[PDB]
């Protein structure tokens, strides 16, 4: 189920999320619990509480199903999740974020000094989320990814990666950064100081 | 509607040992059909939940045998046996029996372990940063235990607070230890007219703080 990583929408605005099975879709707030809104079937079930604020369609031709959130409030800024039960299979989500800034992409910059740790600074964006890795995955073990923090409309991000000393910089490391709002991702091959 | 209660935000284990999360409903999950629709989930930070439990006591495919489920019509348990670190996490419970479809508040499993010093590292800002007038200097304090810990920045010998924004990490997964980030951020007019950078770790594990500091001009 693929659904866009995220969507910044202006307060009062609406926006339409895309996605024999039952499409149901999720909400869940930043560090918050999980609500279920509805779901199709591609007959349609709506949770009271969203009757309206939510209004869930499907589109046999391209397969996609879709939540049209209206009149968006800060009470609206979540994850949404699409999950098909035929085991349910979650989606990624799509973190929306209601504001009246405007998206900002990051500035990434690379942060080099038995072992030795490398870091990775994520600078200025709007909004969340990003998604950070290292050497596109390869390297989990020993990373440490620091949850955003907001200040002045910008969110800043740092994460830590530690290897034994002996294999770098001989064996490459690079930082990727994903931001779907700005549709760009950044490399930052670390380099010695 | 039914509600899903979970009677505990977290709850602490030490490695190896065995736990219980609870979870219970307004009204029977049991169906006339003999099936009783009551999902056990597990989520991680930045990933969507992970189906443990279905029908209250069937441990779904791919999860440990560690996991199990019981419960009698209203009142449910998820077992974590011999529990490792990996099974950090927020676990939730979730009634499928009728519509609207609720979840309960969600349990956090939190791992006690053996106390460790932070490992400290500085980083002064990079030059694609001071090229845009923006000096940021960083310090990691990774891998330590317990959670609390205090940072200290100083600049040429004077305690810094203005500038400062710090970000502590979920329990790690690998080592269950916990880990923080310290950023400064200041503008290359100021940056550049002061030389030494220190950031401080003061920890329980230690009575004088963990220090790093570098020098511009070195
Ligand atoms: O009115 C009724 O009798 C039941 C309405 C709910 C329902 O049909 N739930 C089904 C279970 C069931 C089966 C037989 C008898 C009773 C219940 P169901 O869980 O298959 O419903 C389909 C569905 O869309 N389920 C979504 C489950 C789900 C949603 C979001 C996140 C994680 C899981």
């Known amino acids: 189920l693929q659904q866009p990583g995220a969507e910044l929408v202006k307060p009062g605005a609406s926006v339409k999320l895309s996605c024999?099975?039952?499409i149901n879709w999720v909400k869940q707030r930043p560090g918050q619990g999980l609500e279920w809104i509805g779901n199709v079937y591609p007959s349609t079930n709506y949770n009271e509480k969203f009757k309206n604020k939510a209004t869930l369609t499907v589109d046999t031709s391209s397969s996609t199903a879709y939540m049209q959130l209206s009149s968006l409030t800060s009470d609206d800024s979540a994850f949404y999740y699409c999950?098909?039960?035929?085991?349910?299979?979650w989606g990624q989500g799509t973190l929306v974020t209601v504001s009246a800034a405007k998206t900002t992409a990051p500035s990434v910059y690379p942060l080099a000094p038995s072992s030795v740790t490398l870091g990775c600074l994520v600078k200025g964006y709007f909004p969340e989320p990003v998604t950070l890795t290292w050497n596109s995955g390869s390297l989990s073990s020993g990373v440490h990814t620091f949850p955003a923090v907001l200040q002045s409309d910008l969110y800043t991000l740092s994460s830590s990666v530690t290897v034994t000393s002996s294999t770098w910089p001989s064996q490459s490391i690079t930082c990727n950064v994903a931001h779907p709002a700005s549709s760009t991702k950044v490399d930052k091959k670390i380099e010695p100081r | 509607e039914i509600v899903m209660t979970q009677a505990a935000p977290s709850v602490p284990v030490t490695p190896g040992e065995s736990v219980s999360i609870s979870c219970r409903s307004s009204?029977?999950?049991?169906?006339?059909?003999?099936?009783?629709?009551l999902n056990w989930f597990l989520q991680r930070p930045g990933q969507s939940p992970q189906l443990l439990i279905y029908?209250?006591?069937n441990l779904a495919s791919g999860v440990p045998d560690r996991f199990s489920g019981s419960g009698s019509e209203t009142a449910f348990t998820l077992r974590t046996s011999r529990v490792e670190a990996e099974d950090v996490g927020v676990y939730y419970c979730?009634?499928?029996?009728?519509?609207?479809?609720?979840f309960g508040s969600g349990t956090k499993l939190e791992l006690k372990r053996a106390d460790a010093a932070p490992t400290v590292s500085i980083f002064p800002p990079s030059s694609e940063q001071l090229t845009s007038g923006g000096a940021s200097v960083v310090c990691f304090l990774n891998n330590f235990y317990p959670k609390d810990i205090n940072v200290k920045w100083k600049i040429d010998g004077s305690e810094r607070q203005n500038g400062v924004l710090n970000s502590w990490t979920d329990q790690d997964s690998k080592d269950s230890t916990y880990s923080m980030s310290s950023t400064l951020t200041l503008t290359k007019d100021e940056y550049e007219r002061h030389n030494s950078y220190t950031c401080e770790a003061t920890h329980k594990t230690s009575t004088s703080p963990i220090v790093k500091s570098f020098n511009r001009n070195e």
């Open positions: 999950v098909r039960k035929d085991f349910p299979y």
């Open positions: 029908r209250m006591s």
């Open positions: 009204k029977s999950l049991l169906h006339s059909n003999g099936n009783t629709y």
């Open positions: 024999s099975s039952w």
């Open positions: 979730m009634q499928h029996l009728e519509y609207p479809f609720t």
